[PDB]
């Protein structure tokens, strides 16, 4: 059932859920920026995924309860719904972590006005993963950022494994130019419709 | 047409865009935008106050301002829980009101496809009959060409041999048409299945989004 999940190898795990929220932010979908698979970008501590203590960030979920996770034939809402559905027992997943983990690193910039930013951030060990993005304000993020896109820098300040209070403060500062370094997963495709 | 009809599948997304659902879906969408207008004003108001107070209080980040900013990161998340509960409440309500009517539209749209195919099948039969009528004419005209009342035995025998060819063609095309009909109808049965389950998954997802948020919004702040 439960395995070791060594990187760069597909390991089939059996994770006990029992109607409990998994608490993960995933990216995937045909209408999504991540079109090459489903990848965890954030794990919440109160959820069952952190309760499993086996899934770090940038792990490609290829299968989920005997269901191959192909992002090409599913909308982003359908992939997100997989992780936000009730499950009675241990869920069977095929997970593919890598060393080095496959990822593309790009950058973003803009100027701020006062109009808030419209991003709900959840600090991670990697950065600050976007949990909710408001459309209709500051259109640049609308065409570049998404729920699941992790922010690793702000005003030149890295957000790697930082306390909650510090990230809140420096994001609250605004008042001018802005610059964020982002990381999006571009994994090797590993399924078929 | 020349190729067989290919029907677009009847999904939940396709129904929203149908003509009958419009009088209902517009009113539902209208309710959401007003309530979202109510929500949008309130976060704007809460953002003004929070962003106006945080300007007061440096890079020490060890002071007694930690309980103050997580006071903000507490009250704002409590408000957002209230917002999203109001939203999910309305969405589920919209599903209950429209639920029976949407089942009805899918049945009616699918019925339309059945009639479309039925008509297509009717034209195919008329086409076969035309081909066969010309066949009968070609056999009579050819009997007038050759010679051997003394030669009428071969034409009647050709007629006995064509009715058999005709009766078989009608038999086999009906078989093909009936399979097309059965396949189409099965498509519809699966559509009704995936419609019902997608709605069930939606509601469940709301339940689990709602539940997970209580221990998650504490780990989130708004920028």
Residue numbers in the entry:
A (entry chain B): 478 to 591, 593 to 671
B (entry chain A): 862 to 918, 926 to 1016, 1021 to 1095
Task: Copy the relevant paper text.
At the inner surface of fly photoreceptor rhabdomeric membranes, the master scaffold protein INAD (encoded by inaD for inactivation no after potential D and contains 5 PDZ domains arranged in tandem) forms stoichiometric multi-molecular complexes with phospholipase Cβ (NORPA), Ca2+-permeable transient receptor potential (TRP) channel and eye-specific protein kinase C (eye-PKC). In this study, we show that the PDZ45 tandem of INAD functions as a supramodule binding to the entire C-terminal coiled-coil domain and PDZ-binding motif of NORPA (CC-PBM) with an unexpectedly high affinity. Our biochemical and structural studies demonstrate that INADL PDZ89 forms a supramodule and binds to the entire C-terminal coiled-coil domain of PLCβ4 in a manner that is strikingly similar to that of the INAD–NORPA complex. The striking similarity between the PDZ scaffold and PLCβ interactions at the molecular level might point to an evolutionarily conserved molecular adaption in PLCβ signaling in the animal kingdom.
Multiple years of attempts to crystallize the complex prepared from the wildtype INAD PDZ45 and NORPA CC-PBM all failed, even though our NMR-based study indicated that the PDZ45–NORPA CC-PBM complex is conformationally homogeneous in solution. Satisfyingly, the NORPA CC8KA-PBM–INAD PDZ45 complex could be crystallized and the structure of the complex was solved at the resolution of 3.2 Å by molecular replacement methods, using the apo-form NORPA CC-PBM structure as the search model. The most important feature of the complex is that both PDZ domains of the PDZ45 tandem and both the coiled coil and PBM of NORPA participate cooperatively to form a highly stable INAD–NORPA complex burying an extensive interaction surface area of ~1373 Å2. PDZ45 binding stabilizes the conformation of NORPA's C-terminal 16 amino acids by extending the α4 helix for five more turns, immediately followed by a four-residue β-strand corresponding to the PBM of NORPA. In site 1, NORPA PBM (‘EFYA’) inserts into the βB’/αB’ groove of PDZ5 following the typical PDZ–ligand interaction mode. In the NORPA–INAD complex, INAD PDZ45 binds to one face of the NORPA CC with the two PDZ domains crossing over the α2, α3, and α4 helices.
